[PDB]
Structures are given as structure tokens and as C-alpha cells.
Amino acid sequence: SKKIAVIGECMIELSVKRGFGGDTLNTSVYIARQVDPAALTVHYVTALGTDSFSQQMLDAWHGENVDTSLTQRMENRLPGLYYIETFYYWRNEAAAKFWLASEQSAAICEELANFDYLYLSGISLAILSPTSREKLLSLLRECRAKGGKVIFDNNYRPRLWASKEETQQVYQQMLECTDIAFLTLDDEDALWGQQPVEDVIARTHNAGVKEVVVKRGADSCLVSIAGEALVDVPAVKLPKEKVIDTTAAGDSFSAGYLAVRLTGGSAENAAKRGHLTASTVIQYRGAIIPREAMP
Amino acid sequence: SKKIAVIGECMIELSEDVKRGFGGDTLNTSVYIARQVDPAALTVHYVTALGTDSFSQQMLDAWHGENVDTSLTQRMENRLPGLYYIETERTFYYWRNEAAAKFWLASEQSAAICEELANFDYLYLSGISLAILSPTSREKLLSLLRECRAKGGKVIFDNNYRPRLWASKEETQQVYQQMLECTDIAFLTLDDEDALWGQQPVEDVIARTHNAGVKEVVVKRGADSCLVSIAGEALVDVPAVKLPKEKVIDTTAAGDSFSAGYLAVRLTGGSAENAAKRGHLTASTVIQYRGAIIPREAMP
């Protein structure tokens, strides 16, 4: 079997109902829902507190067959919290920010260096200190040196960074450590200024990235593999009335794409699955849709 | 009319069905004073800082609806209110460490708001109001209190002690000592004094507090009687009217509502004894309801 570790943060979510939500955790759940665990196991890597909100999260994740054995619990921290009306965040002291700055960080990183795949988003980098970002980048390099592959989702939240220049510098270091990049085009527009998709693709290959997957909302997905012709796969047009909530469209697309791509499927079939997944998700309220209990 | 400014923090409150409201020790007190005084005799001003968000807005409107004036409360672009979460036997969870309220003395309106406050008849704050401020901000506040008193204002302190908000017991001790050297009326919850300074006879709690300079010491003893000691005068000792224990639903806000009831009377010409009676009456009613702020209709 192969193993993927998904690194980032999941918060307490308020919308009045209470759940949980985080871009990378959403992605982890959709991968786990779609793969044969004999082919690929999904590990979420974060930190939480020893409180009962953290517990309820861990429990639900185990119910989704997401392995949390590399997630840490920190006695004097809580999860971050966000509220949906507009988003409001109470996340600047989250346990998740500190997973690379504890006494257990080292052993966890030695375990992760041996993983087949490591995945993280722009948010996963944003929440780390400059020093923790360095440690994470070194882990990625070590994993790749051992034959592992690094996947990055460019999910861009300017409010989490000190400046546009800081994000650019950190994304540049990240792309130089990346094998597969998921780039939401609007996010590349926002971060780097508006540029033709061909230049977005080119500069990303120039950073060293072999496989660049460009997500374009309702426009088609472009997959560019260095030295190969472009793959162009249209989305699953739904009538307007079936679209209820576009939250997690992007995160679930990355999930569907990897469920296929990391179990032997073509880039075209991986894109088809990303589109099918995102299309399903947007027809139900909430980031995480009801599990298919009986397929 | 006289003006009292009440200074501290009100947070976004979640309680779990899951409901959203707002709560904070000094805000609860402000609301309870505002519910019981003649606006011609005494106006109530809450002094804090909030966000520009709609949570801050729902708070401001709600307080306006209670006749609390918010003109000296700041709205901060890049900050949100603190937020807390109650799970119900209750557990409390906090996300309060970047709340706007922490920074009201570190802004560009700070000096000018303080200039208005220096001229007020009464300034009131609690130990929580002090805990959330940086050392530098605490010093400016203490400076404001001195200026106010030199102008003939009176300073009122509620010792509400929350050790989680402080760096150390030593730090709390130092800042309380400084506060009490600047205080005219001190509401001392006796369990808080025991926790902060070690268990000592109530007579010594009273004496040391007079010794620090405080003229009127009001000791809250939960179900036990209220003791009011005014320097140079015999002790005043006022029991609550006994309440059947099954009617006690939620002791939340008991102490904050007692201070409010006391001040609604004491600051409008009433005796220490009637002020204590109204403290007890207010607290008695309050604890018979779920939530810090009971319904207007429920009031004494």
C-alpha cells in the first residue's frame, strides 16, 4: 500500500450550528472516501488541543478512515475557530500553527520523510512561523530525496500573510520543492497579477514542478506535464438550481484528482474525477457532504 | 446628571442547540446599573473597543437598547471582539487574546478619550479590565485614575480575579496593590481575596484595603452576608433574603449584578445598607435565570 500525509489546519466551524472545517482536512476526507485503503492510506498531520472539540474532530476523522496517528495533542492550546455569517477567524493561537515547534516534531518528520506523498496548501504555509516554514521546506526536500512526491495546492488567503511579497517568496521556495501543483487560477491572478494561463504554467514548470494542474472554476481544467502536450478537460455543467454552496469546490477537486492520479490513473481521468467530485459537493450545504453510506 | 464610565471587555458568547449572544463582567454590571437608575440622576457609559464587524454592531445596538451610552467605545478596523464558548455543568473556552478591548489605551483616540474620562464623576473597572491590558496600557489607565480623582471623580474597583488571564500571582498582586492605592470604593469578592492573597480573616481583608487608602470596602460573601466598611465608621452587615436552592439556575453574573445593584443605590444618594440590600435583591433575581443578562421584564 502507498501512504499520503496531508498537512495543515482544521478549525472549529460555526455557521447556529457547530462543526469543523479546514481546506486540507476537506481534501483528506474526500481522498479517503474515494480510495481503496489497500492502495492508499490517508494521514492528517496537524496539532489540536486535549479538549473535547479536538476529540470530536479526531473521532469524526477516524470515522472517515483518516489516520491521525501523526497529529499531536497540546494540553495548553485549543483549535482555531471560524464563524460563517463572510468569514471571521479566531485562529492566531491555534495548536495547528505549532506542530513543527514541539519535542515530538523531530520524530514526526523522520516518519514523514519516508512517506510516498506529502500534500499541503498555501494556508498550511501561512499559519507557520518563518522558522517552521523552513523546517517544513527541509522535510519536503528530504522526502523527495528519498523518492517521495510533494503536492501543493496554492489556496491563497492574503489576510493570513504579512504582505504580498512574503507570500510570493514563500510560494517560490515551495514550488521549487513541489512535484504536482494545483493552481486555482484566480488565486494566481490575485497573488502574481493577471497573466495568461500559458505563463502561469510556464513559470511553474520553470520552478521545477513536473505536473501543473490549473483549476479554473467553471472553465476547463488544464493539466500540463513537462515535455507533454496540454491536457484540457471540461467541467460537468449543472443547471443553476442544483448549485447550493460553492464552498470546498476547489479542495474536493484536488481530492478527486489525487484519488485517481495516485492510484495509477491518467491525468485526463484524474481531472474528470476532480470535476465529478466538485460537482457533487456544490449540490449540498457544507464543505463536507453526507458520506455515501451505501453506494 | 452624574456620569459613570464602566471600563473593560465584552465578548461574543456562544452557548450549547447552540445560541449566540454577548457577555462580559463589566458590561453585565453596566446593563444592570442602566436598568435601575434615573437617567436624569446617572448616565451609564461603557468604555471598550470593538471591531467594525457586524458582531460588534449587534453588541452596540443591544447596549443602546439598554440605555448604555457607547460614545467612548472605539471601533477597530483590523480587530474582532474576543469570543468565548460555554458547553453545558459548564465548561468555558476562550479566544480572547487579540480582542479589540485589549488595545483601547494603545490607539490614536486613547489620549482624547482619557481626557473625557478624567472629567467623569465615577470610573469603574474590574480585575479583568486590568488583566487584559499590557503593562504600558495599565500604567496609562492608573494615570487616568489619579487625574480623575484629583478632579474629584471617584474610582470603583471590583476585584473579580481570573488567574488564567495573568502571567503570575505575583503580577496580579502588584497590579491590585497599585489599583487599590487609586480606589475609592472596592467591591471585594471574599473567595477572590483568599485565592489571590491567601486565606485571611475578613477583618484583615477590610483593614489592609483601608490601609491602601480605600474609603469604602464592600465585601461580597456569596450566600453569606455583605459587609460594608467605611473608614471611621462601624461595620454594616447585610444578609441576602434566603432563596430556595432549586430556584438557583445559574450563578453566572451574580457578583457583577450585585455590584450594579449596590451602585444604582449608592451613587444616587442611598445608604450603604440600602445599597447592599439592592445588591442582594439584584443578584437574587439574576441567578434564577439562565444567562448573564436576564430579560428586562424579569427585573426586581
Of A16, A78, A92, the CB nearest to B20: A16
CB contact under 8 A, B16 and A14: no
Q: State the cell numbers at A51.
A: 479538549
Sign of CA dihedral A269, A273, A274, A276: positive
Domain ranges of chain B: 1-300
Whether B69 is catalytic? no
Alpha-carbon radius of gyration of chain B? 18
A43 conformational bin, left if phi > 0, alpha if psi -120 to 50, beta if neither: beta
- Give alpha helix (H) positions in B38-77: 54-64
How far away is chain B from the Cα of A180, in angstroms, using its nearest Cα? 36
> What is the CATH superfamily name and number for domain A1-295?
Ribokinase (3.40.1190.20)
- Residues in A touching B91 (Cβ below 8 Å): 52
Of A14, A89, A92, the CB nearest to B14: A14
CB contact under 8 A, A17 and B16: no
Rounded CA-CA distance B91/B85 in Å is: 8
Sign of CA dihedral A68, A70, A75, A78: negative
Please, which residues have CB within 8 angstroms of residue B274's CB and are 6 or more apart in sequence? B265
Q: Angle at the Cα of A170 (from A167 to A171), degrees rounded to 5? A: 80
Please, which residues have CB within 8 angstroms of residue A191's CB and are 6 or more apart in sequence? A154, A156, A164, A167, A168, A171
Cα–Cα distance list, B258 to B232, B247, B268, B286 (Å): 24, 17, 16, 9
Question: Phi and psi dihedrals of A84, rounded to 5?
Answer: -105, 120
Helix (H) / strand (E) element for A84: namely strand A81-84
Cα–Cα distance list, B123 to B45, B118, B153, B211, B275 (Å): 9, 9, 8, 21, 18
Largest Cα–Cα distance of chain B, in whole Å? 54
Instruction: Indicate the resolution in Å.
Output: 1.9
Of B16, B54, B95, the CB nearest to A81: B95
Please, which residues have CB within 8 angstroms of residue B158's CB and are 6 or more apart in sequence? B25, B26, B29, B124, B125, B126, B127, B186, B187, B189, B255, B256, B259
- Is residue A267 helix, strand or coil? helix
How far away is chain B from the Cα of A50, in angstroms, using its nearest Cα? 12
- Residues in B touching A51 (Cβ below 8 Å): 93
Rounded CA-CA distance A122/B132 in Å is: 33
Is residue B29 within 8 Å of B260, Cβ to Cβ? yes
- A78 close to B (CB below 8 A): yes
Query: To 10 degrees, what angle do helices B190-197 and B202-211 make?
Result: 80
DSSP 8-state secondary structure symbol assigned to residue A216: E
- B54 close to A (CB below 8 A): yes
Query: Per this entry, what is the length of chain B?
Result: 300
If one looks up domain B1-300 in CATH, what number appears? 3.40.1190.20
- Is residue A278 helix, strand or coil? helix
B81: nearest CA partner in chain A: A90
What was the structure determination method? Answer: X-ray
Residue pointed to by grid coordinates 435583591: B281
Is residue B283 within 8 Å of B258, Cβ to Cβ? yes
How far away is chain A from the Cα of B95, in angstroms, using its nearest Cα? 6
Rounded CA-CA distance A147/A198 in Å is: 29
The amino acid present at A126, given as its one-letter code, is: A
- A51 close to B (CB below 8 A): yes
Residue pointed to by grid coordinates 485503503: A37
Is residue A254 within 8 Å of A278, Cβ to Cβ? no
Rounded CA-CA distance A169/B244 in Å is: 66
Least Cα distance to B46 among B132, B107, B113 occurs for: B113
The amino acid present at A251, given as its one-letter code, is: D
Least Cα distance to B135 among B158, B164, B168, B112 occurs for: B168
DSSP 8-state secondary structure symbol assigned to residue A229: P
How far away is chain A from the Cα of B4, in angstroms, using its nearest Cα? 32
Of A18, A86, A90, the CB nearest to B83: A90
DSSP strand pairing (B83-87 vs B91-95): antiparallel
Q: What letters, b where the CB count within 10 A reaches 16 and e where it falls short, cover B208-243?
A: bbbebebbbbbbbeeeeebbbbbeeeeebebebeee
DSSP 8-state secondary structure symbol assigned to residue A242: G
CB contact under 8 A, A81 and B83: yes
The CA dihedral of B265, B268, B269, B273, to the nearest 10 degrees, is 10
**How far does chain B reach from its first CA to its final CA, in angstroms?**
24
